[PDB]
């Protein structure tokens, strides 16, 4: 972490600003990926009567 402070300070601005990519990064809804899939099931027609 050696840089003139003005330069080192500049890195923090860039580094954190891309930390808000990680607050909404890969979605933890891997179980609810099926709940994304479950939203399309109920508009299935009843073929079998």
């Amino acid at each position: 972490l050696l840089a003139t402070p003005m330069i080192n300070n500049a890195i923090r601005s860039f580094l954190t600003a891309w930390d808000d990519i990680r607050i909404l990064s890969p979605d933890v809804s891997s179980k609810s990926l099926s709940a994304y899939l479950d939203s399309a099931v109920a508009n299935g027609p009843e073929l079998i009567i």
């Binding site: 050696l2 003139t4 402070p5 003005m6 080192n8």
Partner: protein, 78 residues
């Protein structure tokens, strides 16, 4: 004032001894006016302790030296 502190400040009493000091405390381009201040903070500590006078090195500055050289120029506008 009755002492030969002339050669002591500019030979010994380093502002940057490149192995003991930290690279964080490297007054880069601003060293022409920065070094005098840092050499007199060293010899102020070197004459205050009650032994023989010794080589006084700036080990490190809390915050970098260009983050303190800018801090003095805020004060130097008063």
């Amino acid at each position: 004032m009755t002492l030969n502190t002339g050669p002591y400040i500019h030979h010994h009493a380093y502002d940057f001894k490149p192995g003991i000091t930290q690279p964080s405390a490297k007054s880069r381009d601003k060293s022409i006016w920065m070094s005098p201040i840092l050499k007199l903070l060293c010899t102020s500590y070197a004459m205050t302790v009650a032994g023989p006078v010794r080589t006084s090195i700036v080990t490190e500055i809390d915050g970098s030296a260009a983050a303190l050289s800018g801090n003095l120029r805020v004060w130097m506008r008063d």
